Amino acid sequence: KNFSLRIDELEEMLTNNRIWRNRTVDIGIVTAEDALNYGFSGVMLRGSGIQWDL
Amino acid sequence: KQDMPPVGGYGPIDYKRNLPRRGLSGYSMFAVGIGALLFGYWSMMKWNRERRRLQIEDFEARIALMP
């Protein structure tokens, strides 16, 4: 009952932070159907497009 | 017959995501900034101008001697 505050700290550490957003935007964009021809499982799938999980 | 789950007493805790507290934004800022900065230069011209007056007094004691 008290874990959603601890995950409410990382939102203010990282998400609306600017330097970490600058360290991570548009980096390593593999999104094609070569990102499924490689036989990937989940995230680095569904985080890029295709909604599916077992 | 000694097993866990209670008959009642629950929350739950949220899954939510919220802390958007504003914050003094949007023409409130850029207005306290310029209003502070113009108080600075107004606090100049009362000291830098005044030090320029005592400066001439410092040269004054030189010139009244040296013949």
Nearest to A1 by CA among B3, B15, B4, B8: B15
- As a residue count, chain A comes to 54
Residue B35 to residue B45: CA distance in whole angstroms: 17
A8 Cβ under 8 Å from any chain B Cβ: yes
C-alpha of A23 from chain center: 14
Probe site for chain B from A2, A3, A4, A14 (most B CB atoms < 10 A): A4
Helix (H), strand (E) counts: chain A: 3, 0
Q: Closest Cα of chain B to A5: distance in Å?
A: 9
Residue A31 to residue A50: CA distance in whole angstroms: 10
Q: Compare CB distances from A2 to B13, B17, B19 and report the shortest one's residue.
A: B13
**Method for this entry:** cryo-EM
- Could you say which DSSP state residue A33 is in? T
Chain A nearest-CA residue for B11: A1
Contact between A50 and A30 under an 8 Å Cβ cutoff? The reply is no
Output Rg (C-alpha) for chain A, integer angstroms: 15
Contact between A45 and A35 under an 8 Å Cβ cutoff? The reply is yes
Residue B18 to residue B38: CA distance in whole angstroms: 38
Reading the block at residue A13, the tokens are 């550490």
